[PDB]
Structures are given as C-alpha cells and as structure tokens.
C-alpha cells in the first residue's frame, strides 16, 4: 500500500576509484528495475540488453521552447483558421519567420502543457473512419493535473571509478503514500463532455460514446508516462477514462516510478535517472488527448 512496497533494498559489490579495491554498497531499487536470477539474487532490468548511461545530474529534463526556423529561399506558412482540423484548405494563412515556442514535452496518453484550442475542443484524425488511426483531441480550456512523490528521498553518492559517481537511493522517509496525480473531478467531467459533444459529430447524435482504459502492452504505452521534477512517472489513468455517455472532489491516479528509462521506444539505449533529493511536486496542464477507437 505504501511506497516501500515498491522498493527492493539491494546490496552489491561495486568498484572503487582504485581498480584493485571493491566496495560493499547498497541502494534502494524499484521493483520495476530489478529482475530476479534463478536475500534473493537480482539484477538490473536493462542489463542483458544494454548498459545504462546515467542521466547526467547537471542537465535538466525541463523542456525549453524551441522555434523551428526556415532557411533562405523557404517560408513557413501558418494556418490562422480556428476551425482548421488538420487537412484541406485554410482560408487564413500567414508567413511567419518561424514557429512559436514548441516545448518538447514528452508524455503519453495526455498532452501535458502546450497550446490550447481557440474556440472549442478540436478532434483531429488522419481518417476518422479508420480505427487504426489515433485521434488527437485538443482542449480549449486546460485541465490542471497535480503530481506528487510524497517521500523525502535521500540521494546517496557512490564512487564507481575515477571521477565517476553513481547516485543511489540510500534511504526513504517522510510521507510514504504512493506517488499519484490529482485531476479535478468536476473539471475533467465537463472536459469529457466537451470532447463527447465534438466527437458525436463524426459518429452520430444517437451513438453511445464510451471511454475505456488502455488495452495492454508496455508500461510506457498503458500508462500516462511522463517526466516531472526529473523523476519519471507512470500513472494509471483508468479513473480518467471510465465513463459511458448517453444521448472540490478530485480524481487520484496511482503512479509508479522507474529509474531505468528506455524513452524513445528503442531497445539497447537505456538511461538511469538518478534519485531526486526531497519531495517532488508537479503542476501541469492537460491540453489534449491521444485516443484510439475500438473496431
């Protein structure tokens, strides 16, 4: 029920800054990062596939806005139409030197932060009649989502070599409630109401719009994977998408945390996100969705 039920207290021999000396150290590893070998014997999960380059502690994962600017002889045309779905003529066009600041927020199932719609929730699919195509919903009013890892983590440094340090979770104290995200129940209900209203235009007024939760697959695809405060969350979002629509309170999404990240859906290049000292707190805007329809 606690955060401590998600952790394994793993002890191992580590190299010292002197090649001929060892170092009996320990660290708290999440159960999602250790795989048993058959005080039992375990090993890090991405160890038969690659070696994990440690997420370097002095570089931040916070996305800064980047503008993509066209070279000489080219121009960037910007569609200023407010009802422009994603395709076809755009009556109002502009030539911008280059784009607005696009924050590269990396997330799944929910478009955290970013740009809102102008007048109404926009539904954008390559072929709305094809269930194999994702539907990019864009909100007009953001839905605020609050993260947390209540634990007061204690980062610990291990010298694994000359000049190289390994940052490990030495101890965990404080509030041991599981990491979670809160979405306002009233705000989310009226946002799905707007999504449903704009979604019946493509399927019928008398059709029944039902939101179910993710089908299956990797934890990166079945969960609202995202980064917040340098530590990577994987939230359930099964209480967000659970409703059937016929023609102060809050929603708490239990989130797991991992330290070994295979981010860009690749195999062979993992990354070890080092522990973040202290309590992590999070304020984001849900500005969109990525939906898939059932055949």
């Amino acid at each position, epitope marked *: 029920d606690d955060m*401590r039920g998600e952790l394994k207290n793993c002890s191992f021999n580590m190299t010292t800054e002197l090649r001929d000396k060892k170092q009996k150290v320990y660290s708290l590893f999440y159960r999602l990062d250790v795989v048993q070998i058959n005080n039992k014997e375990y090993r890090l999960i991405n160890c038969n596939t690659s070696a994990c380059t440690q997420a370097c502690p002095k570089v931040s994962f916070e996305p800064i806005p980047i503008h993509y600017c066209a070279p000489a002889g080219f121009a960037i045309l910007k569609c200023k139409d407010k009802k422009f779905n994603g395709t076809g003529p755009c009556p109002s066009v502009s030539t911008v030197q280059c784009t607005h600041g696009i924050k590269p927020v990396v997330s799944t199932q929910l478009l955290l932060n970013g740009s809102l719609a102008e007048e109404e929730v926009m539904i954008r699919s390559e072929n709305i009649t094809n269930n194999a195509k994702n539907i990019l919903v864009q909100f007009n009013t953001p839905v605020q989502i609050n993260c947390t890892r209540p634990n007061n983590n204690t980062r610990k440094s291990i010298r694994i070599g000359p000049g190289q340090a390994f940052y490990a979770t030495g*101890d*965990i*104290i*404080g*509030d*041991i*409630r599981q990491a979670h995200c809160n979405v306002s129940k009233a705000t989310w209900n009226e946002t799905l109401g707007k999504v449903v209203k704009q979604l019946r235009k493509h399927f019928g007024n008398n059709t029944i719009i039902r939101f179910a939760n993710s089908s299956g697959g990797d934890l990166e695809v079945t969960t609202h994977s995202f980064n917040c405060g340098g530590e990577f969350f994987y939230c359930n979002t099964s209480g967000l998408f659970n409703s059937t629509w016929i023609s102060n309170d809050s929603i708490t999404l239990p989130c797991r945390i991992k330290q070994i990240i295979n981010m860009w859906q690749r195999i062979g290049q993992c990354m070890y996100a080092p522990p973040i000292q202290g309590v992590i707190r999070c304020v984001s805007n849900i500005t969109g969705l990525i939906l898939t329809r059932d055949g």
Partner: antibody
Amino acid sequence: QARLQQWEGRPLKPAETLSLTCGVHGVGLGGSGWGWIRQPPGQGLQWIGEIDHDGSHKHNPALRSRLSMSLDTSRNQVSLRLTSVTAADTAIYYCVRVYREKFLIGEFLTDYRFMDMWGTGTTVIVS
Amino acid sequence: AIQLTQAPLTVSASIGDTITLTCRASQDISIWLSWYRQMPGKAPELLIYAASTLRGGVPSRFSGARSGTDFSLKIKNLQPEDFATYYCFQSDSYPRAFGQGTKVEIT
C-alpha cells in the same frame, strides 16, 4: 563488548580550549550520529551538540560560536573543542551515539534519534 | 525551543511498589520521547525510546505510554537497582532538551 570509552582530561585553567575525545569500540562512526551530553553537579543533563548521519552539525543555541566538533573516521574518535571555558562549564561530559530507528506513525516515516550508547564520564573542572 | 517538565522531582517508595513518572512537554512532540536512568555516580542508560519501546535488556516491568503531551513511565516490582534519577529526552525539534530529573529513592 560495544563500548564508548573516554579518558579524563585533568583540570584546566579558565578561558582556554576544552578538548575532549571519545573512543568508539565494538561499532564504528559510520551510519549513526555522535553527540555530547554534559551534567553539571547536582543538576540535570544538558545537550551540547551532535553530528547526524548526514554529517550535519546540530549545536545548542546557548553555546554560541564556541562549539566545534569533528569525527576521526580513521581512529574512530569523536572530538569536542569548546572554547573560552568559564567556571559554569564544570560538568561531566558524555559521548553518545544518537541511533536512528524508523517509527511509522499512521502515514509518516521518521528517523528517530535516541542516544543508544553512552560514554563513561569525563569530570571536567576549571579553576 | 521545547521545554520538558518532569514532576514530581522526588518520589519515594519501598521495594515492590508501582510508580508512575510524568514528563509534560511544552508543544506536542508526537511520541518522540526517550527515557534515561542515571544510577548515582554511573552514566545514564536508555530505558524506553519512542515513549513505548523497551530497550534490549530492560525488564518488562518498565513501560511508557501516551503520544501527546503528558508522557508517563510506569515501574512495576521495584528493586534496589531502580532507585536512580530518571530523565525524559525529546527528539522532535533540533534544540534538544532534557527533563529536570526525577530522583526515586526508598521511603
């Protein structure tokens, strides 16, 4: 057999430096925290200061800027360097190990420090 | 800082009695209050930590209670080794403080 041994430093002249040293046997300086407790004659105990597991120096507000402690990891010794000693500082000085046990209140986990292991006593008299 | 008030400053009882010692805190220090016994001339030793947990080796007669402000320690089946000075020590706020000391003697 785990004991903290400290030896008498003999009487010292007023307005000098008070150098104490505690010998840690059975256990080592790592992992716990090490502090100093005194006891003026005919009175109760008084907290001087401690170094916690993190290496961070908690000091009593009453003794301002005259406190300084250090840990000799190589020799397993805890040192006290009280300066400008006045006649009111005549007390038996104890070296203690503030041990951390985690106690779970309903939803909160805390490091509880409870001075597991006490020294023997160093009667310090200034005249 | 936090001030711990320990009363009565001197309680007298014969061998084979039951005594209750009180240590009242200023603020609420949760349950973080440990008890130390100082035999005359010796060094203080830990009896109870977290106001309820018995130290390894302390007989089951010793017991504490309460997690608010009026902490209490109860001794059963008094023996000559229990006639010492008891101190209550809080561990909530970093300006640490001790009790005044309850000197338990024979009548």
